[PDB]
Symmetry: C5
Subunit: 311 residues, 5 copies
């Protein structure tokens, strides 16, 4: 067993396909997802050709170890995939049809910039390294790229599974390597973030602004500091579900900005009280009266600016 | 070793049965559960037939590798199941009786809409792919579908384990595939949610309403904001036990609605105080007096509406 | 290799023994524990007889694959146990002595009703399924059931490891199955729950009752609501260490009841204040004075009632 | 392949050594640690000797399966160790030198009594069970017990790795078993506990005592209850890092005692207020004045008493 | 199969190369990271040479078991690496080119002193132990050390992957061992720590200082104690992401210092109130007036001092 030799001096073309059976565990923090799929491989091995009329049979079967099979590997996996050879068929002209069912944990970076209203392109990169007697090159048989209808990935919507047809061919340690890019396009179901995080977070913020209709320092200090604490909780909660990025994320920005609002609210609450103690309630009164409008307005303007920058 | 050929031109029928020995780890978040069971397979392989008389035994035993065994696989598993062949028996006319004990982690979506008063239908999908010389088709031998009496699944009640007798047959990459649907019907034991989450959550809400019998702004602000914080804790707790759904869940809705109650309570507490400072306690007095009735009543009406929509 | 045939028409008796070397990870939530032990099997196989004289050796040693070994399996495990055959001895008469060292994760329900003052009976169920040529039946060789002295199971006291000598024999999918029940009796070391949970929880409750010696509504509201929150924390803590049961647990009940005390305390604090504002401190005074006695007394009575119901 | 027979009637001595390459994951809760090391075995097998002069080779090599190797196993591991045979050398007189590299997860109880100022003795117990034709006995070749210089175990200081030279020999299920005790002496680096837990915990306690310089009930109640809550947080934090012991631990005791201080502080705060409302500020005044001294003094005395009892 | 013998009496040189394909899971707490890479080995084995001419081949291929392959192992791994031999080539003069793809979990200490503005040098140590017939020595073929462009390690920037060319040779249990040090230089992306932890932590501290512009003891006590609690939360959060070090870390120091500020603020708040009650507001007034400047100034000075000591 060793590679089938060139008729002329052409590279060996291995036709590939991936057909997703299952998708699970898209782990945002680790930036990985698990996949369970059929991997199909096809290539011409002439040493294996036979006659259809005299052979009586129109297709022949083989056990993995009996014939040469190209070593296809995934680039971005954690560990070598788990594979069960399902079937190997050889037709008269010596065309081999290989089919395996595999499962793997795939590494694939996510762009958290628009979280939780983001979309991602997961990748599964197939690769093959040329042997000494000949160069192996990959291709996509579109007929065999797909996914079953039930493939659901919790908390995500699956848009499409397609392969970039043209391999990237390059040299790696003095041998040719042929690599294919299968893409799984998904978008996050942001729905639940609304009632679980966003609204509660806004509610507590608005509750903080009631201090602008109160002349009680002690009350205000309680309103503002208490809610600020609840905000910290949401901040901590949100940040435990994301990995640490070197860029601001949309939610990250809103969350951060909101601290600025609490800080300024505290200042206002402080100033108002100070003026009152210093026997000048009228300045205090008009600073608070202004704040009742400024706060919601600037909060609204700042958010529009952010949504614009981010979307 | 290769498939037994047709007497006429019929498909090969593989009779299947699953018999649950253990059920554990129904993981709500991941939407998976673990199973440990017997898988039984039966089919006719004539090349194995024999005369009871000349051979002096009514049954014949084999080791897996010695005979053709159909490749049955589960659709919705994470990894290829863990299997020990328990026994392979062949009777005179060449009927094979295969028995394996396996364990697997099964993917199966849950409908969280009525959590925690929900019921689910877990599925185990058996599948087989036709080979080139013939089509394989699955069937359920009801005699061999079951579960032992001790099979308990923590925090769930097991209603039934049955198979949909008629396989779904379809083409997948130009070969016929025969798939069976075994169903495990369970319902969640909602009992503990009552004292651990529901009642405590109601208690803190009712405590908030005592603010309606208090003319102390500072006190009220403390009652309302404090309890609101405890509510956030229950909210966070509850949401860490569920996955993120693109639909409102029953508990989710109650939890969310309750925030609305805290927000409105804060407004009332604010308005009441404001009016009092502005030297009009009588309007304040009657807004509070109304609230004592409105709050509980609207809370009760809103809940009836929800239970109706959800159940 | 296939079962040894009957002298008369008796079943084949396999003598078993389990000798615990290690016990760890009793996981309350998952209801499992890990075990590491010797499994010993003995049975007559006459086909293996030999003459010490004509073979030089008093005992023969065999390698697993060389002889028939009965397929013993555990019922309540997650995955097929991890086994290393330690030794296989055959005495001339053909008695086989088999010794393996295994490790497994065992499923075994716990009764949380008296937590954390509970005791449990863990089970390890050995099983064997009869083959076609003969029935296999299990037995306990008490001489070989035990555990080493150092076997410690963190946070539990080990009472005893014994086997129920009489197998349960029954039919399962048309073959006889012989099952043995090994029992590991343990009791939880409740000690630490005292300083870590119980006492702190009582301290915070008693602290709340100081509100009964205070005429300050604002103070009281703080005492009662604050401690109520700390109670919620202990409640959450406790419930993260237990699985969800369809029955009230002892701690669960105490924890729940205590909420009732906080709720009633809030009412009292509310009533007292209300009356005071309404210019009737004398009724208030005597409601508070009553509460100072009622609360501790009813708390004590209710606890005695519970301990009685639970123990 | 079977044991080498006695020249006289002596037991077979297997010389052992463990050389630590890596130490990691000392998990306090689970009471385990992971080890990666060389295991060396040596024994005389005469059937394997040869001529030094005639052969021209000073030593000779074998593959594991070609010769008898004694079955050495670890007592206190979770699963059978992971082993790669590195090399097997046989010298002229038939002395075999075996060397493997293994990794294992070792169970070994810790004494938490002085946490976090504790020291531990981890154990790795080698064992061998005698065969029928002869008794195997273990010994330590000190020349081959050691650890490399870089072996660092996070958050612990490594004192020494030594073996108790004399095996413990005993009968277990009617065969002799020879067991060796390798000891790894470590001591916890308590440093970080100081700024992360101990000091913060003291700071919050001292902050509570400022209530003794305040005549404001409402303020005090806030100081004392707030800090008590922060104490609960540290308590919870600390207890999540330790397993549950049936004995008080040093930190456990300090933590517990401190609750007593909060409880008594609350009483004092209550009494002081009560007396003040009852128009007797002078008794109140002298109870508070006493408390300013009593609290710190009794806290200091109690701690000295504890350190004495524990150290 | 056994080592190729010396032409003269030279050691056998094994040329090595590591080419990173993937980097993930740098786990700060455990001090490990996962790697997926090509490992290339090359050495001269004369027994394998051939004449290019009477063979009609430039190179020859082999299966692992057919030829001698040096046992290269990693020092600092948890478990023996997962390896797939990709290809083995032998050129005419008997030079072997071996290529495997492996994945492993590597142990490698981190210096947390400047967290989160730290840089680290991860190591992968290749090793080989000499056999009896000859000494094996490692070397780096720089041509084959590298990493692919996409190698991203979440939350870290990858600076470089180089090997220290000169092996460290030493004796270990009476055999020579040759060890190589591959270094992966990374630096932490500190960006997110700014908005998620640092700033929030400063905001709450500054909010505490508003107490210096308030004459309300009750208010102040709330401001100072509340924020102190939020600080504890950030402290706990931060410390759950780091392992426990025997040295102060930069963040650790800032965090600790800040407690000192809260403690002193509480004292000031206490003193101010005390003086006020004692009818001397003017001393109080000037202590508070001083604090408004002292606090921020000393906080700023202390930070400059720390950054200096740490950076």
């Amino acid at each position: 067993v060793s590679p089938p030799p060139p008729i002329a001096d052409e590279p060996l073309t291995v036709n590939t396909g991936i057909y997703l059976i299952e998708c699970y565990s898209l782990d945002d923090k680790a930036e990985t997802f698990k996949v369970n799929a059929f991997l199909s491989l096809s290539w011409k091995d002439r040493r294996l050709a036979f006659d259809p009329v005299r052979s009586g049979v129109r297709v022949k079967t083989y056990e993995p170890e009996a014939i040469w099979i190209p070593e296809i590997r995934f680039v971005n996996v954690e560990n070598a995939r788990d594979a069960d050879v399902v079937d190997i068929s050889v037709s008269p002209d010596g065309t081999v049809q290989y089919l395996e069912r595999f499962s793997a944990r795939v590494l694939s970076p996510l762009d958290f910039r628009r979280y939780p209203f983001d979309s991602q392109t997961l990748h599964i990169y197939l690769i093959v390294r040329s042997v000494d007697t000949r160069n192996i090159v990959l291709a996509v048989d579109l007929e065999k790229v797909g996914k079953n209808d039930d493939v659901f990935l919790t908390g995500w919507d699956i848009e499409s599974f397609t392969a970039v047809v043209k391999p990237a061919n390059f040299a790696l340690e003095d041998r040719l390597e042929s690599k294919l890019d299968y893409q799984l396009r998904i978008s996050r179901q942001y729905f639940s973030y609304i009632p679980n995080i966003i609204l509660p977070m806004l509610f507590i913020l608005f509750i903080s602004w009631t201090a602008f209709w109160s002349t009680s320092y002690e009350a205000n200090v309680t309103l503002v500091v208490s809610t600020l604490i609840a905000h910290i909780f949401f901040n901590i909660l949100v940040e435990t579900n994301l990995p640490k990025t070197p860029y601001m994320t949309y939610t990250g920005a809103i969350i951060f900005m909101i601290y600025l609002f609490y800080f300024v609210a505290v200042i206002e609450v402080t100033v108002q009280h100070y003026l009152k103690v210093e026997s000048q309630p009228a300045r205090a009164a008009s600073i608070t009266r202004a704040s009742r409008i400024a706060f919601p307005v600037v909060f609204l303007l700042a958010n529009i600016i952010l949504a614009f920058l981010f979307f």
